[PDB]
Amino acid sequence: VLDLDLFRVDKGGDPALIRETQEKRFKDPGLVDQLVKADSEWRRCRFRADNLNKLKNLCSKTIGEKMKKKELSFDDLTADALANLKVSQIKKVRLLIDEAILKCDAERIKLEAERFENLREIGNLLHPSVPISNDEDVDNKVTSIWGDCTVRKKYSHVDLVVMVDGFEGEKGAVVAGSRGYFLKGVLVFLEQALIQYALRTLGSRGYIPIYTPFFMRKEVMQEVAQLSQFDEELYKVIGKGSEKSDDNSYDEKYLIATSEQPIAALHRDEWLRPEDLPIKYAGLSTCFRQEVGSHGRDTRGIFRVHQFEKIEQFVYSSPHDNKSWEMFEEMITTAEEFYQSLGIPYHIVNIVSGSLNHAASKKLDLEAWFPGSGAFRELVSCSNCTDYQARRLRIRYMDKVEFVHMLNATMCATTRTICAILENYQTEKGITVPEKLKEFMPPGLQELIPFVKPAPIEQE
Amino acid sequence: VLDLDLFRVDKGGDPALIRETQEKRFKDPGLVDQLVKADSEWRRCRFRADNLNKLKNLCSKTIGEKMKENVLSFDADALANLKVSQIKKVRLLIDEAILKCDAERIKLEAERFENLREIGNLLHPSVPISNDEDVDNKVTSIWGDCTVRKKYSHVDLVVMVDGFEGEKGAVVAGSRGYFLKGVLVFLEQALIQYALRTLGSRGYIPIYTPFFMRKEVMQEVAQLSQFDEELYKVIGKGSEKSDDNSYDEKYLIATSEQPIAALHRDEWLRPEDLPIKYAGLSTCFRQEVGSHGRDTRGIFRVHQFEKIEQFVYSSPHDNKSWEMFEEMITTAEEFYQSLGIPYHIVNIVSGSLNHAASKKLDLEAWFPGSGAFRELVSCSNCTDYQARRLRIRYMDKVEFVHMLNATMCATTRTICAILENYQTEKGITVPEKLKEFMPPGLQELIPFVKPA
RNA sequence: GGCCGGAUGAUCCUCAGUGGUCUGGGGUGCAGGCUAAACCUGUAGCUGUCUAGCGACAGAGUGGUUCAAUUCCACCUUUCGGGC
RNA sequence: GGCCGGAUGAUCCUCAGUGGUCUGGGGUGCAGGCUAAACCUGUAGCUGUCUAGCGACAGAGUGGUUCAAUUCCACCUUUCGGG
Numbered sequence A: 001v002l003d004l005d006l007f008r009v010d011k012g013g014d015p016a017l018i019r020e021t022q023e024k025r026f027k028d029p030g031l032v033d034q035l036v037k038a039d040s041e042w043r044r045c046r047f048r049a050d051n052l053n054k055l056k057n058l059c060s061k062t063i064g065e066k067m068k069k070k071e072l073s074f075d076d077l078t079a080d081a082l083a084n085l086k087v088s089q090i091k092k093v094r095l096l097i098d099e100a101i102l103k104c105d106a107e108r109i110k111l112e113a114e115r116f117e118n119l120r121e122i123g124n125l126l127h128p129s130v131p132i133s134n135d136e137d138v139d140n141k142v143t144s145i146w147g148d149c150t151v152r153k154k155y156s157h158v159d160l161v162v163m164v165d166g167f168e169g170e171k172g173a174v175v176a177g178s179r180g181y182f183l184k185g186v187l188v189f190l191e192q193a194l195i196q197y198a199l200r201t202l203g204s205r206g207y208i209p210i211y212t213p214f215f216m217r218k219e220v221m222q223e224v225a226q227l228s229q230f231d232e233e234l235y236k237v238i239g240k241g242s243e244k245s246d247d248n249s250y251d252e253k254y255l256i257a258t259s260e261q262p263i264a265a266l267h268r269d270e271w272l273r274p275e276d277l278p279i280k281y282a283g284l285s286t287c288f289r290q291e292v293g294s295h296g297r298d299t300r301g302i303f304r305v306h307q308f309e310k311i312e313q314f315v316y317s318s319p320h321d322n323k324s325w326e327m328f329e330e331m332i333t334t335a336e337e338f339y340q341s342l343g344i345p346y347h348i349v350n351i352v353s354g355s356l357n358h359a360a361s362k363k364l365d366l367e368a369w370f371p372g373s374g375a376f377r378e379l380v381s382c383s384n385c386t387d388y389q390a391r392r393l394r395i396r397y398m399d400k401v402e403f404v405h406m407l408n409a410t411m412c413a414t415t416r417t418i419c420a421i422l423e424n425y426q427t428e429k430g431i432t433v434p435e436k437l438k439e440f441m442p443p444g445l446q447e448l449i450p451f452v453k454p455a456p457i458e459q460e
Numbered sequence B: 001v002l003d004l005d006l007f008r009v010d011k012g013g014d015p016a017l018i019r020e021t022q023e024k025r026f027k028d029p030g031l032v033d034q035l036v037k038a039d040s041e042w043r044r045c046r047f048r049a050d051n052l053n054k055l056k057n058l059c060s061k062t063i064g065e066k067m068k069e070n071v072l073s074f075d076a077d078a079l080a081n082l083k084v085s086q087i088k089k090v091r092l093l094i095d096e097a098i099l100k101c102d103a104e105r106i107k108l109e110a111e112r113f114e115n116l117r118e119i120g121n122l123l124h125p126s127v128p129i130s131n132d133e134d135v136d137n138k139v140t141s142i143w144g145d146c147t148v149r150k151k152y153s154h155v156d157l158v159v160m161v162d163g164f165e166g167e168k169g170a171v172v173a174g175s176r177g178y179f180l181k182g183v184l185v186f187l188e189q190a191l192i193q194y195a196l197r198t199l200g201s202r203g204y205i206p207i208y209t210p211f212f213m214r215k216e217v218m219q220e221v222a223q224l225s226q227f228d229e230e231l232y233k234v235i236g237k238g239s240e241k242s243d244d245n246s247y248d249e250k251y252l253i254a255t256s257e258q259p260i261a262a263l264h265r266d267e268w269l270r271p272e273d274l275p276i277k278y279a280g281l282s283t284c285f286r287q288e289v290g291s292h293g294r295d296t297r298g299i300f301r302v303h304q305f306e307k308i309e310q311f312v313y314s315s316p317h318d319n320k321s322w323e324m325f326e327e328m329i330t331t332a333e334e335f336y337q338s339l340g341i342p343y344h345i346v347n348i349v350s351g352s353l354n355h356a357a358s359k360k361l362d363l364e365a366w367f368p369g370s371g372a373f374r375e376l377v378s379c380s381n382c383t384d385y386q387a388r389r390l391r392i393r394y395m396d397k398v399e400f401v402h403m404l405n406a407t408m409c410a411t412t413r414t415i416c417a418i419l420e421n422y423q424t425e426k427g428i429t430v431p432e433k434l435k436e437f438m439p440p441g442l443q444e445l446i447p448f449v450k451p452a
Numbered sequence C: 001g002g003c004c005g006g007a008u009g010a011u012c013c014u015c016a017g018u019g020g021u022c023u024g025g026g027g028u029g030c031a032g033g034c035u036a037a038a039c040c041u042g043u044a045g046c047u048g049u050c051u052a053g054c055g056a057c058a059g060a061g062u063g064g065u066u067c068a069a070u071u072c073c074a075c076c077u078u079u080c081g082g083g084c
Numbered sequence D: 001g002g003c004c005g006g007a008u009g010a011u012c013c014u015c016a017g018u019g020g021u022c023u024g025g026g027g028u029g030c031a032g033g034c035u036a037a038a039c040c041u042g043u044a045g046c047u048g049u050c051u052a053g054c055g056a057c058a059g060a061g062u063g064g065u066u067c068a069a070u071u072c073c074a075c076c077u078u079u080c081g082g083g
């Protein structure tokens, strides 16, 4: 949520720059114009109600002084000092006044919701470095690489996961209903190894490991999610809403798609002290995405699925200076040092504003090389959400309120990384366990993961 | 689901023994009587429809040979003699007569399955016959040192460690919600790591299960009460297209048991490898509506948690299923003794025993700080009950496999258990086995950075 | 946990009044006439809206009652108490 | 991706035929005969009901036209052919 004083030309800001950022974000403007109109209308009815309340006070004052002495025409907007009037005359006015403040009360109760309806779907301010386009496959500014992204092995991550016999998809489709899977055996330990290391990595950096709830009520979710996320991403969960045998009511909930949302809402409506402001968080959570926007893409593998575990970097920081951006760079550098230490070739990709969602100001996502698949695949996505969500969740820094900047970046998607190491470490007998991962693996697997099953695709 | 030939006195079984088991399970009978009536009715209408189609076949046979408007007679006899116009007029009334029966049968099959759905498994004679667990529970062993106390509840300790923020968890999840943070995460991660490696050392297959299961399958692996006061319903798009505005109801799992059971639904299983082990790792989701105002400050009974479970497919022949059952509870015993926690084995009475289980031995562990025993483990032998429901087969005369399930470890409850049983004045001492998987700085002990 | 209670949120702090737009003892600190201390006056915070600005007006938990509520009442947030 | 065409499911292989509860030519696994192979003859998978048992009847993806649908049109899923 952007600050409201930005729309007022009376204040420092201008709506023209907002329209520009809307066009550059590739979201159709006009919502800005409706915001401006509803705003100015909420200025009118506010001044009306304030003046009607001022006259409301002026009436009883006349009623008070005249009553200390003793014991039918309209003049609505011409509300003078005017002592002279009967108590019976003044009392008759209050009725018409009350109805006049009521119509404005409804007009304001509808205006506030109308303004918030548009403001809800207005994106954050972009950083000048962000590429201005809509096609990522074209205008993505690649900004570094590492390892050995010139080799291939010819063995898809769909195939290897069957040859290892750590995957039964046909049954997972029976249970969960398409894309469902049963991760079994060695692949479990490997994942458990990843989580174990990744956490210890962030723990070595100075992050606070936090296991988050996998669902959040509803009211909170709306504040930390745009419409599209509710439409084609989040799984709704209906609960009893009351732990009593008597109550037959319900309370709508939703499953999280990331640790980002609970960790963000962890410090909702707070006062954060600058004495410790560089606050780090390492969110461990299973993540649930409907992924409705895709159909017939990565259908045989486990790269894009409905359920998975994923460790998250989440950092609260101070808005002052560009120390938020320096922390942003420090975070992506940490992820770089991480996937470097893992020994996987990758390249940094700058996502265009067209694909950038509302909250983020700048989104640098990492794509990793798949030698067996012969492609690059988004394995990370760092984001600087700035004060956008911080103003929405009302998390504070006197006077003239300042909001902190909030960020998020996936340390590791346990199922995609799984595919990544499956292809990049293969041999003729099986997948060699990376030197770092050998630490957490059990004996028998610590050497390498063997193939106890042939290639999934036989023929006639 | 029990076998249907048990109700037929024509077959080997008798419904009198079923009524007895219903009374002993403390579920009101009469559903057995309704089962029997609907059954015999489904025998009548089946015989009706079978004879009516036999006659339906006999009609066209006459029509066929004669071919190589005359109303006739009353309404099976010999055939012969009769016009093709006479016979053709009969088929209409017949068709309506088979239709009324078709509806009567389509309602009878669902009516019978409605009652059979809520009929419990056959109990094992060892099972205590009562309804109050706090009274008639037969304890069968113990270990460790269940005579000591420390005076420090698992509610306070989790705050003193500063690995818990409940007031915010209640804001997000809505009561009982929690944010497990810091050292408590590693400890949990240590548990999972060890527990898996333990079962992996035993010869179990670690399996990460889906946390939701369509709907149709669920109805087969869950009774009514579970749908009423336990499982969280999840509404999904049902189609990954921008065009489809439909929905498909789902539910969240309360145990790994349900996905692992449904993993081999409708299969042919070979005796060559029948002793099949499974070690199901999964987050578990329970509404826990049946409780309110019980363990409200702590994290013993919550809505969400991770939980590793033993799941074993076995052969029905001999009592090798029961021997495997004993082997499994013995494995859990060897596990928690290796953890070094005082406990005692409790035999749950039939009154609290659900439909699926034939015998349910649950482990209660000692809480020195709380001064009580708490349910952490829950071994169950579901036998062929679910295996007949999920149609998991073994020539001739079909035989069903016996299925079992037993929690290896509840990561949040066991967390409380080790929180109380390993406390010192500075903090909780890390168990000798757990020191292996902990990070340096914590490997010694978990300190208190917050007061009570 | 239960009642019966009190306090309570947003005018510098505190005790307390009072249905008349508020009053008063008393207090820390602020500006200064005035004779370190003493005595007098005067001032006091946040939000919203109006003006370029000085400035003014509108808000005091959600509501009810009344022309009018800080007080009379209801109910909520938190806090203490006669207590069990 | 959408078009002019391909198959399906529940009858041991296949070929084709064919509105009468199917037919025929030839080839895998049991059984039997004559005497390694060939040849000769019968059978075949599952479900449900009925007699206590022999055995028989009912079911072949759902649904219309026909008395009768392997056969002729409609629909479902999956997998396959040239583009």
Ligand SMILES: Nc1ncnc2c1ncn2[C@@H]1O[C@H](COP(=O)(O)OP(=O)(O)NP(=O)(O)O)[C@@H](O)[C@H]1O
Binding pocket: A289, A291, A303, A304, A305, A306, A308, A310, A365, A378, A379, A380, A381, A410, A412, A413, A414, A415, A416
């Ligand atoms: N199905 C998934 N499984 C695991 N991680 C995922 C999945 N979808 C998205 N992510 C994570 O999201 C991060 C970046 O993608 P993000 O932009 O958040 O969503 P996105 O644009 O949907 N990704 P995708 O849905 O695959 O196109 C990746 O680094 C992943 O780690």
Ligand SMILES: Nc1ncnc2c1ncn2[C@@H]1O[C@H](COP(=O)(O)OP(=O)(O)NP(=O)(O)O)[C@@H](O)[C@H]1O
Binding pocket: B286, B288, B291, B300, B301, B302, B303, B305, B362, B375, B376, B377, B378, B407, B409, B410, B412, B413
């Ligand atoms: N709320 C819970 N938290 C952790 N584990 C649970 C919970 N409920 C059941 N379990 C697991 O289920 C097994 C024993 O409980 P169970 O036999 O299912 O009934 P229970 O103890 O009545 N359910 P509950 O009312 O939560 O106590 C153990 O393996 C437990 O760890």
